[PDB]
Amino acid sequence: MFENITAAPADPILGLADLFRADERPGKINLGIGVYKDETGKTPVLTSVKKAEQYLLENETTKNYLGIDGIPEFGRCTQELLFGKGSALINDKRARTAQTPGGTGALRVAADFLAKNTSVKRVWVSNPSWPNHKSVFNSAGLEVREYAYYDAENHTLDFDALINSLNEAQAGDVVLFHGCCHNPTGIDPTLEQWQTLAQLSVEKGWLPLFDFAYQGFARGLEEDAEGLRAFAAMHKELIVASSYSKNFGLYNERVGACTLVAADSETVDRAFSQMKAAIRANYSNPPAHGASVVATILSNDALRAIWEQELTDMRQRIQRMRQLFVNTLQEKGANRDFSFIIKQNGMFSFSGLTKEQVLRLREEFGVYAVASGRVNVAGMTPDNMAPLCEAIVAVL
Amino acid sequence: MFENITAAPADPILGLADLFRADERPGKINLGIGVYKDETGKTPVLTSVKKAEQYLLENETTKNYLGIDGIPEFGRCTQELLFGKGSALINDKRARTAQTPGGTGALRVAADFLAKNTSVKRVWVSNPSWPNHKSVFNSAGLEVREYAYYDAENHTLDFDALINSLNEAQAGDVVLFHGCCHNPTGIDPTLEQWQTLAQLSVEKGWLPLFDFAYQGFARGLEEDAEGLRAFAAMHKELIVASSYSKNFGLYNERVGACTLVAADSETVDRAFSQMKAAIRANYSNPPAHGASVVATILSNDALRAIWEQELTDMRQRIQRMRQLFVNTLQEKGANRDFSFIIKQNGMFSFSGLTKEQVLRLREEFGVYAVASGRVNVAGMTPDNMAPLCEAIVAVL
Ligand SMILES: *Cc1c(COP(=O)(O)O)cnc(C)c1O
Ligand SMILES: *Cc1c(COP(=O)(O)O)cnc(C)c1O
């Protein structure tokens, strides 16, 4: 039965890693990575995370199953994190949170939940967006359409084309928004633009679905949520798929959550059981380790004080690199203006390099980037900065 | 939406739980659990596992992502447990293993893979079977049919009725077999019956799919694989969904594997690529903690020595309870013959009690069991053996 099965195509982020490895030049650089790296080039385990893991080693007495929705404190902590400590969505018991395997797992579950218990046929994602969005939504058998977003000429948010493309969306269509640190552009709306999309969202009858994977990387844990929180003040319904991969550096333990908010307690409870029904048919119940680690840190003042500092250092290192990158490009004679790079948030950014330029970078120099010209700013260290800027200047 | 979402029907096994922890009267006894309990009535963390987790704490230096298929060593250890140390399947590089979230997660990906890259439309599961098999296969769009298995009268495997209903099955249909310790029955085919089923399959064109969740619980690690291994000797293709939840007490860490085998390596490599695309659109990559613990134990001679001892003790404790159960029933006046309980394997068995008797058993107090009459022998201790039996004898 597997005889005529056709090879699945190679993934971009994934196909470059190898070629990089087997590149085996001398002083090469990987800017196509999808993870955080520190000054030294490694992706360490947060100290707060390691203290939490010792705690668990010493206190876990069983590995008995978790409920389908996972750890309760994990669910409280995230709700507070998203909607804020005093939010009414929480006090009116209007939101229900399920622990899932990663931000991606949260996304697939919302998809299956939506595709089987609702009249949703389409989900609108930005152009561009993390590539894996189309694949998760196509799996649950939903259509994905594209809305404008990025201005390739000016390197900003073409708010107009956005709104103008979002008028084709019908009442009842799902619209996906990146909460902060848009992947891959690094371009996020302003608070006033978030408020405008909120009003437009209820007027048109759209179902907002937020993918919140980088809370804490643009400006702060709280500032990074004004957008989502601006929609939650106005909507009756909403879905949030968040992930703790980047911000707790817990990538391989699959830690995220899919939050459902309805008009009230009875509807979320009724709607959430169908969401639990969808989890049961997929992976049954979620992996305890990462989530226990997150609940433990978020709920101890000592440990949480340390995590916030660690997350702040990551945030600040990234903001250093973006400044030092446009600065070193300038000293090296950089032909063009890369200053827009400092206006964008998070680890990603389109460098505005040409597919053929990216190829030249990888062949003639050791510089590796994704064909879209997307580079991961976290792969830049003060040490490799100079040879990197010199290679890019040589291709402009 | 969400306005008219109808509630999901309470899951049977997960319903008694709350009625149990609501009862809170004297010598309550939950036998509807689906987990192992020792003589203390607790589900401990295997010591071999605690040792592995400390080693991990001290040695991990990153939580960066695992490949879609997970840890390589996990994949190879799994393959040896299933097929044996020198299997041809291994030497010919005919099998590819994906680390997965739980045995249930393996079933789901075998299913999405099968549903998208193949002509399968049907999957046959025994009657009765783990209730969740219909749900996972259905959520993938495959229909599920039932072959006969249990002899309600004689408390055995109706071989003939099984082979007879299986004749309704067409070529290119998936047949699902439980490798050892049939859930909920505990009735497994003999080696001569496995071989008979292996030969009939090759000639009818059935694609076999093994659900192997209790390796090590019927007779031994190797012995429990002889059925799987009789099939693998005469098939070009087959799929195995194994779980390490029960035999490693890693219930909540979500640890399992989906093994694909094909006629040769280029096919399996090509088919596996599509299996990986299915994972990537589900949860992306798998949780490391548990699978690291398993690979670590299975790799080190000292720890594996200890783990095996720990598995033998669980296996021997269950075989002791089946025996003390049918012995304490006899001497307590039980008028029926419960001998078949000793001939069954694993944690479960149908007591052959009517729906009305389980209800009466529980209300008239004490005993909680699944309405099917299914009972978990691991929930019995030498301490509750007498009251349990008194209560069963009082209702026959
Ligand atoms: C990283 C990311 C996710 C997923 O987080 P994971 O825990 O790695 O699955 C989802 N959406 C976006 C936009 C992301 O960047
Ligand atoms: C326990 C079990 C599974 C699943 O193991 P998990 O790791 O919990 O998913 C699958 N099939 C049967 C028959 C089982 O008993």
Count of residues in chain A: 396
Burial state string for A192-220 with b = 16 or more CB within 10 A and e = fewer than 16: ebbbebbeebeeeebbbbbbbbbbbbbbe
Show residues of chain B in contact with A254, CB under 8 Å.
101, 283-287
Q: What dihedral do alpha carbons B153, B155, B157, B158 form, nearest 10°?
A: -10
**Cβ–Cβ below 8 Å for B1 and A119:** yes
Helices (H), chain B: 16-23, 47-59, 72-83, 88-91, 102-117, 132-139, 159-165, 191-204, 226-234, 265-280, 288-299, 301-330, 355-363, 385-393
Tell me the three state secondary structure of residue B130.
Answer: coil
- Closest protein CA for atom 14 of ligand 2: B213
Let me know: does B98 contact B279? Beta carbons within 8 Å: yes
- The owner of tokens 């909680």 is B368
CA B114/CA B274 separation, integer angstroms: 10
Phi-psi group of B85: left, alpha or beta (phi > 0 → left; psi -120 to 50 → alpha; rest → beta): alpha
CA B202/CA B198 separation, integer angstroms: 7
Q: Is A281 on the interface with B (CB under 8 A)?
A: yes
CA B50/CA B303 separation, integer angstroms: 10
Instruction: Work out the number of other CB atoms within 10 angstroms of the CB of residue B61.
Output: 9
- Would you tell me which residues 38-97 of chain B have a C-beta closer than 8 angstroms to some C-beta of chain A? 42-45, 49-50, 53-54, 57, 60-66
In short, whether B126's Cβ falls inside 6 Å of ligand 2 is no
Closest CA to B82 of B250, B230, B222: B222
**Cβ–Cβ below 8 Å for A132 and B45:** no
**Cβ–Cβ below 8 Å for A285 and B8:** no
What secondary structure letter does DSSP report for B6? Answer: P
In short, whether B256's Cβ falls inside 6 Å of ligand 2 is yes
CA B195/CA B177 separation, integer angstroms: 13
Let me know: does B363 contact B375? Beta carbons within 8 Å: no
**What is the CA B72 to chain-centroid distance, rounded?**
23
What secondary structure letter does DSSP report for A396? Answer: -
Let me know: does B389 contact B325? Beta carbons within 8 Å: yes
What secondary structure letter does DSSP report for B281? Answer: T
Cα distances (Å, whole numbers) of residue B265 to B99, B268, B271, B379: 19, 5, 10, 45
Show residues of chain B in contact with A253, CB under 8 Å.
63, 287-289
Q: How was this structure determined?
A: X-ray
B176 is written with which tokens? Answer: 């699902």
First to last CA, chain B: 50
User: Looking at A101-173, which runs of residues are DSSP E strands?
Assistant: 122-126, 143-147, 150-151, 156-157
Catalytic residue among B69, B112, B173, B246: B246
Contacts of B380 (CB under 8 A, 6+ apart): B31, B321, B324, B325, B388
- The owner of tokens 């939490």 is A52
Cα distances (Å, whole numbers) of residue B174 to B201, B230, B279: 10, 17, 20
**What is the CA B269 to chain-centroid distance, rounded?**
27
CA B217/CA B180 separation, integer angstroms: 8
Let me know: does A138 contact B291? Beta carbons within 8 Å: no
Let me know: does B98 contact B68? Beta carbons within 8 Å: yes
Tell me the three state secondary structure of residue A257.
Answer: strand
A213 is written with which tokens? Answer: 């994977």
| B307 has catalytic annotation | no
Q: Across-strand partners of A240?
A: A210, A259
Closest CA to B28 of B40, B19, B15: B19
Show residues of chain A in contact with B207, CB under 8 Å.
1
CA A24/CA A19 separation, integer angstroms: 9
What secondary structure letter does DSSP report for A336? Answer: S
Per-domain residue ranges for chain A?
11-44+316-396, 45-315
DSSP states of B243-273 as a string? E-TTTTT-GGG--EEEEEE-SSHHHHHHHHH
Let me know: does B331 contact B91? Beta carbons within 8 Å: no
| B63 has catalytic annotation | no
A193 phi, psi to nearest 5 deg: -75, -30
CA A120/CA B328 separation, integer angstroms: 58
Tell me the three state secondary structure of residue A118.
Answer: coil
Closest CA to B343 of B235, B193, B188, B194: B188
Cα distances (Å, whole numbers) of residue B148 to B167, B170, B175, B208: 11, 16, 12, 16
Count of residues in chain B: 396
Q: Is A3 on the interface with B (CB under 8 A)?
A: yes
CA A204/CA A170 separation, integer angstroms: 7
Let me know: does B299 contact B73? Beta carbons within 8 Å: yes
Burial class (CB in 10 A: 0-12, 13-18, 19+), B204: middle
Count Cα atoms within 13 angstroms, Cβ side, for A101.
31
Count Cα atoms within 13 angstroms, Cβ side, for A221.
21
**Cβ–Cβ below 8 Å for A2 and B271:** yes
First to last CA, chain A: 51
Q: Residue B145: enclosing H or E segment and its boundaries? A: strand B143-148
Name the CATH superfamily for B11-44+316-396: Aspartate Aminotransferase, domain 1 (3.90.1150.10)
In short, whether B103's Cβ falls inside 6 Å of ligand 2 is yes
Catalytic residue among A69, A173, A188, A211: A211
| B194 has catalytic annotation | no
**Cβ–Cβ below 8 Å for A283 and B7:** no
Count Cα atoms within 13 angstroms, Cβ side, for B62.
11
Burial state string for A296-332 with b = 16 or more CB within 10 A and e = fewer than 16: bbbebeebeebbeebbeebbebbbebbebbbbbbeeb
Q: Residue A281: enclosing H or E segment and its boundaries? A: none
Q: Is A171 on the interface with B (CB under 8 A)?
A: no
How far away, in angstroms, is A164 Cα from ligand 1 center?
A: 27
Q: Residue B188: enclosing H or E segment and its boundaries? A: none
CA A89/CA A95 separation, integer angstroms: 6
Paired sense of beta strands A207-212 and A238-243, if any? parallel
- Report the topology of domain B45-315: Aspartate Aminotransferase; domain 2 (3.40.640)
DSSP states of B196-244 as a string? HHHHHHHHHTPEEEEEE--TTSSS-TTGGGHHHHHHHHH-S-EEEEEE-
CA B330/CA A116 separation, integer angstroms: 51
**Cβ–Cβ below 8 Å for A8 and B274:** yes
Show residues of chain B in contact with A102, CB under 8 Å.
283-285
CA B359/CA B171 separation, integer angstroms: 43
A327 phi, psi to nearest 5 deg: -75, -40
Q: What dihedral do alpha carbons A101, A103, A109, A113 form, nearest 10°?
A: 150
Handedness of CA A325, A331, A334, A335 (dihedral sign): positive
Contacts of A203 (CB under 8 A, 6+ apart): none
Q: Is A395 on the interface with B (CB under 8 A)?
A: no
B146 phi, psi to nearest 5 deg: -120, 135
CA B178/CA A287 separation, integer angstroms: 24
